[PDB]
Design a protein around this ligand. Structure first.
Ligand SMILES: CNc1cc(F)cc2c1[nH]c1nc(Oc3cnc(C)nc3)nc(N3C[C@@H]4[C@H](N)C[C@]4(C)C3)c12
Length: 190
């Protein structure tokens, strides 16, 4: 399972250098992209947190939270624990997911890929979507755990263009360099 990912990360993310570090972002963002293609997500936020962790927020339907017959576990748990999203989980010190669905916020967290506790309703909400936050593991990313805002922004812009109509932003919250760029290419309303 994911134990193999932690021992051979090069086979799953291509490189454990800075390139692999950034690849984790795209693996998560690609899920939000898929939910935009499904027609439900309209906006995606990518945030570099002050500690070089990453938050990705979409306003889609939210990852399914029901128990799957095949696994006996909530669908959202399987997304992160069974071998892109599960690879990011495995290579992070911690990953937390919040699903905003049916007036509830469903929460689960993992540590170096391992489940902390069963999925739990933690809050009520009026919004919908999925928020994933992860802290890349320096035991894996031994060269660098520092994100490149311009590198992320460049690809986010490309992604906005390829997914015309999508709102996507990138934000840096790190000390002395706070920045944000927002992208949106218009559809037929142009
Ligand atoms: C930061 N965002 C983020 C991050 C993330 F890691 C996953 C999702 C994610 N956002 C997501 N939104 C949905 O939306 C749905 C809702 N309902 C259904 C039936 N399918 C997709 N599904 C999601 N998933 C992930 C798996 C495939 N892309 C389809 C899934 C089996 C379910 C995500």
């Amino acid at each position: 399972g994911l134990e193999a990912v932690r021992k051979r990360p090069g086979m799953y993310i291509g490189s454990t250098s800075g390139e692999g570090l950034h690849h984790l972002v795209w693996e998560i963002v690609d899920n939000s992209i898929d939910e935009a293609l499904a027609g439900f997500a309209k906006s995606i936020q990518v945030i570099i947190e002050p500690d070089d962790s990453i938050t990705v927020i979409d306003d889609g339907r939210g990852i399914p939270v029901g128990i799957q017959a095949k696994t006996g576990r909530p669908a959202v748990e399987t997304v992160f624990t069974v071998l892109g999203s599960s690879v990011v989980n495995a290579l992070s010190t911690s990953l937390d997911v919040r699903v905003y669905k049916d007036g509830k916020v469903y929460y689960q967290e993992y540590r170096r890929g391992a489940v902390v506790d069963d999925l739990k309703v933690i809050e009520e909400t009026d919004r919908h979507g999925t928020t994933v936050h992860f802290i890349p593991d320096p035991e894996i990313f031994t060269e660098t755990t520092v994100y490149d805002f311009d590198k992320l922004a460049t690809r986010v812009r490309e992604l906005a263009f390829l997914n015309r109509g999508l709102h996507i932003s990138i934000e840096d919250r790190r000390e002395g360099q706070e920045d944000k760029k927002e992208y949106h290419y218009e559809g037929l309303e142009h």
